[model samples]
Target: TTHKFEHPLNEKTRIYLRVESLLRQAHLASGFADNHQYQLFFRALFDMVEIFEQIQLKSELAKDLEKQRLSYRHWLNVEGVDQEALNSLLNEIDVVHSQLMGAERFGQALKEDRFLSSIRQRFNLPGGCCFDLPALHYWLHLPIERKKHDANQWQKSLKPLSDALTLWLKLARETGHFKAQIARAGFFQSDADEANILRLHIPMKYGVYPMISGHKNRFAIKFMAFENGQACSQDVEFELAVC
Candidate 1:
């Protein structure tokens, strides 16, 4: 097995990754298999909402999508380009970009949700027991179908943001392909050259992982020996994508 790690080099990409992760967690926990899944679902949703409140996500994402759409137009003039595929992607970007630009603040509906708002206020506090929030307790014990319907409705409210983010990250990741590299004496450092994120693939058998640090201009990867918790002396071979 290969362990894949992604490190965002800029603040925008960092936040994008975070939102994407939390959204994914929320979706996964939407199954509401048990009390634990409900807790996980609420936690992810609340965390995502907090982040949304702190950032102008709709504008930022729309701007990035517009930038991408403009960039793709340049390819039309190049020879041997796949015209059909390019046009299809351009259409997709146009549709998503417009939706994002026309939409209200991300998670606005969720913010106004009475049930979720009540839970959000107490979720992070100590001892959020059933007594503290009988509403949550009652909701959790509801029939599975009823719970699923509510979860789906909440998820639907955020679908536009989710779709736009998914496309933007997909394009960002496709910007680079993984290349083999070696970390000499457990350390590798290189110029980032305007890269937004670094993707690493390390083999499980190596028994080590990278401790990465960097900004847009440069980055360093130090392979730490996982078994003994020391700097690895052996040459570590890995694959990296400067996306």
Candidate 2:
């Protein structure tokens, strides 16, 4: 007989949520100790995979539900995972939906699995110009590693981070006109200004203004620079977008 898993509001879930939230903060916590960034991110990566597996295991135990494995995506190419895994998962989603399963009843079964699961992700460091898989497994979470222990193996486990942006873009999209206005008016302070370092997440759109002649599906940006701290300083602008 399948035991009904009593989904209790519990500490484990709290820990998971805490971890995820920290990750989100770490992403933006530039210069707050890059090593700490790496450590937190590494832990987050480790827990994320195990959390993925746990949802599958528990759902299967209580409801006879099974999760299809995910495809491994490459980093440089930015393509996420093996298509086979995604296809299988999609098919299973179809199966469950075809049966008309109610999310309210079993949402916990699929609790930790999501497309934008990283939003409140706990802070983590971005380290080593490489996707971190080994450090993830070494944390003793996932039972088996997909990629072997090669220096370049991190490349094998990750999708291009370029596409892996914050899910808050929907808000930004609504404010596209707002951002445009800000850019046009030179109102660049979207957040609190720092004493030592200044950082901005300018959408590539306005960064390349006054030079939008080319029909380009390009990742490009333009920044305006002024010489000196005086009003009489020369204003210089340059455009670039990393491909």
Candidate 3:
């Protein structure tokens, strides 16, 4: 089967993941010219900014990256570790750390955009129009290329956080490889390691899906019926990767 599940086992990492997801949706929506898509992009953008304001997102990420960098540096002379690979990783982390170090509070400049400022209040409303938001309507009607270019420019302003988030998430996913597993009578449990994320791959034909929950030391997974609300009684084989 084709579907996959990814869960962050910690709260802070989960927050970073949510931001990455929102950024991706914002980017995708900005690539289109449709008015609805533009609205979707704006909504995502505003939501991201709102979250950034409340949370010290970039600063926290920067601190985490610094810690990771120190850990890797400590590994440079460790026995049996590949020096070349370790060096590469250290370099990558350094670059992201540098970018994050230079980052300013997100959306500070975007708040100054007259176009965005004009409709910021009503953008979250269910329905809006030229009568209520003439500036938005006027901007939405601009040439497609111009809109795309402007969107790209704004995206660049948020690049540092985006880039760092990608790096951390990539490393998190790379921490482990998927291994064959089985759920006896639709239940499985295991200890979590240094990697605090779980990735599950299961076949769709089985008509079962996993419900995962837990914390650092241990976690459990239960397979349940996709259609009706019932546990799968049969043994189910799946692939799981902890990272």
Best-fitting candidate, measured by TM-score?
Answer: 1
Off by over 4 Å in 2: 1-33, 56-243
RMSD after CA superposition, every candidate: 1.8, 18.5, 2.7
lDDT of 3: 0.82
Off by over 4 Å in 1: 77-80, 126-129
The TM-score between candidate 2 and the true structure equals 0.20
Top candidate, metric lDDT = 1
Clashes of each: 0, 25, 0
For residues 1-243, write the lDDT of model 3, one tens digit per residue.
Answer: 467988877776777878888889889998775657876788878887777777778777887777667766668789999999988888889988898888877887778777777677787678655667777777787888998998998888889899898988787677569999989889999998655578999988789888888865788899899999798888888889987
Ranking by lDDT: 1, 3, 2
**TM-score: model 1 vs. ground truth:** 0.92
Give, for candidate 2, the lowest lDDT window spanning 10 residues.
1-10
What lDDT does the true structure give each of the candidates?
0.86, 0.30, 0.82
Give the C-alpha lDDT of model 2: 0.30
Task: Give the alpha carbon lDDT tens digit for every residue of 1-243 in model 2.
Answer: 111111112333333344335445434432223334445443444454444444432232223122111221221234665667656645654454334332233223223434113422432335343244444334323222322122123222321210111111121222222112133333222221111111223434332222111112221122343233222222322221111
